[PDB]
Design a protein around this nucleic acid. Structure first.
Ligand SMILES: [Mg+2]
Ligand SMILES: [Mg+2]
Ligand SMILES: [Mg+2]
Ligand SMILES: [Mg+2]
Ligand SMILES: [Mg+2]
Ligand SMILES: [Mg+2]
Ligand SMILES: [Mg+2]
Ligand SMILES: [Mg+2]
Ligand SMILES: [Mg+2]
Ligand SMILES: [Mg+2]
Ligand SMILES: [Mg+2]
Ligand SMILES: [Mg+2]
Ligand SMILES: [Mg+2]
Ligand SMILES: [Mg+2]
Ligand SMILES: [Mg+2]
Lengths: 139, 195, 109, 191
RNA sequence: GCGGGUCGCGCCGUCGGGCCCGGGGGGCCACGCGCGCGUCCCGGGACGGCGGAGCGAGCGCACGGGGUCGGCGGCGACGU
RNA sequence: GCUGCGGGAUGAACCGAACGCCGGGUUAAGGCGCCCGAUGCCGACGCUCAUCAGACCCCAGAAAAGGUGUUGGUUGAUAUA
RNA sequence: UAGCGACGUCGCUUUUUGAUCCUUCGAUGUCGGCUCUUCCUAUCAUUGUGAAGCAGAAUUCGCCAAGCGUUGGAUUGUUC
RNA sequence: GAAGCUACCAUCUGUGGGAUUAUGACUGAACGCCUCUAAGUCAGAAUCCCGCCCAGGCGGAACGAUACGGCAGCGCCGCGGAGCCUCGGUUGGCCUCGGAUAGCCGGUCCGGGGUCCGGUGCGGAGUGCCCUUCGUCCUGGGAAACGGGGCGCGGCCGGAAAGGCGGCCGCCCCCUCGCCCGUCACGCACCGCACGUUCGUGGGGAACCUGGCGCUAAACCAUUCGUAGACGACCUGCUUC
């Protein structure tokens, strides 16, 4: 319980606002509502964004208190947030939502025919497995 | 078509606002589990306001005049009456479209219940503020049917457990089928185009 | 085979608090719930389908009991994504809480 | 003023064990077990120490009344630990007037029956709580011992006794009679 | 020594004089070569008039042009 | 008075604004939980728990006084002697 | 400061009286009594309580509280 | 002075549960102590609500009888044909309880504990499934031993708060193109146009001809009665033993 919390040196997602879908990193908390965030390599500029505007993640960084953009970038490239962030399921969820937004009609036709084929095979296998379960439980 | 709404953990005014707005458009909405609709404030204040509402009555003839329902479904139906234009054949037709129930009826046992996030206690209220239960208020004043409704509610909860165990067993079986092989050829299309 | 029209619900007339203006009608169209979402539907054409016991019909094969007052989308309305529409004949006011088809022609796809 | 975290520290001895499935606290020791619910307060209850048993009661931002509330959890946890290690014993001397009071127990120490009650003929019956026992003390005149595990249950039973013995419709400065709480302590002493 | 006016020198400033006398890419609704009529300047540029000198003419068309037309196209009967 | 219209639920005097018949756009006074058109903005800051909460000039109710109920603020006084 | 409270001061009520004339002059029948129904509390008693200069009894001051009671008569046309 | 009305002028009866106000408390911080309170617990009354008692809603149940006669008339199942009225949608979702300072899933051990996952939820309503299938024929790859609809039969009741579809077993007239990938040729290609495709074998009302199974009444008036009555209304009798 309470595995995550804001911290000097924590990367955080941004859901709402003008920098949506862009990771920031908390430098210091100003007063209860807003934190001075910074982006070394995620194309977002050093500013102050609200906590309800951002979204907390799990990865931490070793930032000194109120360090430069240079030291933020060095700790970012030491921690390797980009490849390790691509290699998780959460970015795959966001990428799948973006691909559903970037579907087309021919892609939906292919998804629907593959959907029909997979659901027919799944229905036949569920029928076969419940038949085998009844045949196992009958003695 | 039909909008079967939960009442467990909702607020009276918020749920009445959303139901009274969505019933004028034509979507036939039914609020089920009306005894669990929470009301903000203190419970002594809520029963004091309801006692004042009972005190409001015509002195020359109490029958011809103010009617004061004690069942919580009819409390919510009066709450939606006081918001719809019920003296005209728009709000009158909307109240004809609206159905309300205490407990859960047997068709609504089978049909899936919706939950409105905009009317929830947790979303709208601070968690260190007091609250009340409309079924508790109704049992305290007038509505003598808590012991029957709670018994039938426990019965349908047992029915829901004995259905959910079978549903979870079938879900484990179909995920064993998905764990099995020779389905990935379509998954090469699907994972690229949003598995 | 298949529905080609989007679903919209006739909500009311253009009105203040006391008086109404029956020349412009309001449509709560499904899916749109935002000012930025009621942009694609600018220029669509609407149709209110109703019934009568006499016979004034389209040339679509056979005569039936179907009558339609035609019209089209004028502009947007509110932050909730409501659609104003001026029909060719004004609304019968029985259509409150009922459905008006929004067909996907002349818009800019 | 929206104060950042307040944490209360509880040491738990090796005689007893604590278990939490949430905000429910279950403390089991030598003298039975005792469990309570802290559902309506929303204060984090964490524990640490491999056979060291360090409980922490932590609350974030909150308000001033809620920073007042966070110490109440620590104090009731201390009360539950004392009740499960030692127990609670309330000794009530019957401060009696011209008419004495005949106190007996009926249902194995769960039904206190009071008689002669300042000359009032009405025999009085007080049913106690499930989890508290009653006795008449030895080597002492008209002392009533209430023994239990939960301080709220034992002290509510003592409050029911001292409010059932109440002078009515009189000057209660005169007629100083009733069963009042004389001593508050534990069952197992010297600890 | 502190103030008011003026004169003389230097430093600037996509400043102003179509800035000029003479030298070592872009834009301009800016044009009769023969030679000779006066003003200004250093054989050449501006102006009124004549020495050159607007020489030949409205031919067709598009007009973001004195408040739109199609030299655009469909569809239905004995009870609408 | 001699004066409609939009708000103030309802109104002679209030606030905008004055009236030939209409279409389009915009706005004032006012409002955007439902009646009842409009915040269904992933609105911002802080205060308030009221067993008689509070809710918009005229306007349809209230004082002197008191509160270790909470939130700021001023003047001071103690404390490793 | 149990109960009181001067000198001063802040409020509530229309159960008295006063002030105005806003409606009513082609009429709103003007006192009291009898009978009858409902409501309020600023509580006389009853139910549950707190405080006294409350020993008991009997009283006084307050709170939640209008559910139920709140007479028979001589006098006066009486309200009183 | 009978019957009947009537008298506190005769006689009988008038009934208990809950949440709580005032108040007194418990634990306990704020504020090392204290405290009835700030979150929580207790006792608590002619107050309040319900019980009991009255009339029962444009409120709903369960059950009986449902039209003889000599032609009749009327119900249930499955039928084909025509025609009048009324108004709305153009797939349906067959379901865990509960929390939000916490919760979901999988799983050895004795409903619980340990362990392993995922978690701005993907065992997700920013979702899942028959699904965008216009249809037919030939010819092949993958999947498929349940076949796939039922005028189908028989058993089980799943479910009682307002229930009618779903599941299993044994056969039946049959179907191995019930679905995705490829080849082939056609069906109105109605030549630019709308209300088109839907749960519809839509709701109820009056009749027309055919198959099977059946049904053979009850109110109201009249008359009588008094336990009732202004008139209506209410309770009653009517067999040939
Ligand atoms: Mg006394
Ligand atoms: Mg005049
Ligand atoms: Mg004038
Ligand atoms: Mg107005
Ligand atoms: Mg007003
Ligand atoms: Mg206009
Ligand atoms: Mg609106
Ligand atoms: Mg007034
Ligand atoms: Mg103050
Ligand atoms: Mg006057
Ligand atoms: Mg007068
Ligand atoms: Mg008269
Ligand atoms: Mg009169
Ligand atoms: Mg009374
Ligand atoms: Mg109290």
């Amino acid at each position: 319980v309470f595995r995550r919390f804001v911290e000097v040196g924590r990367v955080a997602y941004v859901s709402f606002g003008p920098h949506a879908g862009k990771l920031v990193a908390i430098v210091d908390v100003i007063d209860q509502n807003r934190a001075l965030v910074d982006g070394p390599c995620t194309q977002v500029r050093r500013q102050a964004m609200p906590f309800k505007c951002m979204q907390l993640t799990d990865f931490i960084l070793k930032f000194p208190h109120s360090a430069h953009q240079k030291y933020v970038r060095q700790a970012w490239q030491k921690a390797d947030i980009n490849t390790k962030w691509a290699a998780t399921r959460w970015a795959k969820k966001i990428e799948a939502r973006e691909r559903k937004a970037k579907m087309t009609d021919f892609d939906r036709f292919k998804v629907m025919k593959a959907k029909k084929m997979r659901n027919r095979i799944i229905k036949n296998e569920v029928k076969k497995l419940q038949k085998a379960a009844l045949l196992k439980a009958s003695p | 078509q039909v909008l079967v709404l939960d009442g467990r953990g909702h607020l009276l005014g918020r749920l009445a606002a959303i139901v009274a707005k969505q019933v004028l458009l034509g979507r036939k909405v039914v609020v089920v589990r009306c005894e669990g609709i929470n009301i903000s404030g203190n419970f002594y204040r809520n029963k004091l306001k309801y006692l004042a509402f009972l005190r409001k009555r015509m002195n020359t003839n109490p029958s011809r005049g103010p009617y004061h329902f004690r069942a919580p479904s009819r409390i919510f139906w009066r709450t939606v009456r006081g918001m719809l234009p019920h003296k005209t054949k728009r709000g009158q037709a909307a109240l004809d479209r609206l159905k309300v129930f205490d407990g859960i009826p047997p068709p609504y046992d089978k049909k899936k219940r919706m939950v409105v996030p905009a009317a929830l206690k947790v979303v709208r209220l601070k968690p260190t503020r007091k609250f009340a239960y409309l079924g508790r208020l109704a049992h305290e004043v007038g509505w003598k049917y808590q012991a029957v409704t709670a018994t039938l509610e426990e019965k349908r909860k047992e029915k829901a457990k004995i259905h959910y165990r079978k549903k979870k067993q079938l879900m484990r079986l179909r995920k064993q089928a998905e764990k099995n092989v020779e389905k990935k050829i379509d998954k090469y299309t699907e994972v690229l185009k949003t598995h | 085979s298949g529905r080609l029209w989007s679903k919209a619900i006739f909500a009311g007339y253009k009105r203040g608090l006391r008086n109404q203006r029956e020349h412009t009608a309001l449509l709560k169209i499904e899916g749109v719930y935002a000012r930025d979402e009621t942009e694609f539907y600018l220029g669509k054409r609407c149709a209110y389908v109703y019934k009568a016991k006499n016979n004034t019909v389209t040339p679509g094969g056979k005569p039936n009991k179907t009558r339609v007052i035609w019209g089209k989308v004028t502009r947007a309305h509110g932050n909730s994504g409501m659609v104003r529409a001026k029909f060719r004949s004004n609304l019968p006011a029985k259509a409150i809480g009922h459905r008006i088809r929004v067909m996907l022609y002349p818009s800019r796809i | 003023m929206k104060t950042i975290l307040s944490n209360q520290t509880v040491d738990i001895p090796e005689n007893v064990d604590i278990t939490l499935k949430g905000r429910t606290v279950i403390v089991k020791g030598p003298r039975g077990t005792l469990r309570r619910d802290f559902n309506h307060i929303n204060v984090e209850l964490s524990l640490l120490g491999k056979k060291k048993k360090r409980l922490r009661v932590d609350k974030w931002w909150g308000n001033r009344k809620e920073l007042a509330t966070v110490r109440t959890i620590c104090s009731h946890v201390q009360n539950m630990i004392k009740g499960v290690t030692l127990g609670f014993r309330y000794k009530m001397r019957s401060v009696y007037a011209h008419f004495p009071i005949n106190v007996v127990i009926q249902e194995n120490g769960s039904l206190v029956e009071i008689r002669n009650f300042l000359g009032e003929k009405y025999i009085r019956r007080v049913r106690m709580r499930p989890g508290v026992a009653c006795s008449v003390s030895q080597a002492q005149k008209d002392e009533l011992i209430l023994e239990g595990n939960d301080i709220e249950l034992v002290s509510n039973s003592a409050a029911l006794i001292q409010q059932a013995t109440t002078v009515k419709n009189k000057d209660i400065r005169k007629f100083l009679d009733g069963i009042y709480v004389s001593e508050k302590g534990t069952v197992q002493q010297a600890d």
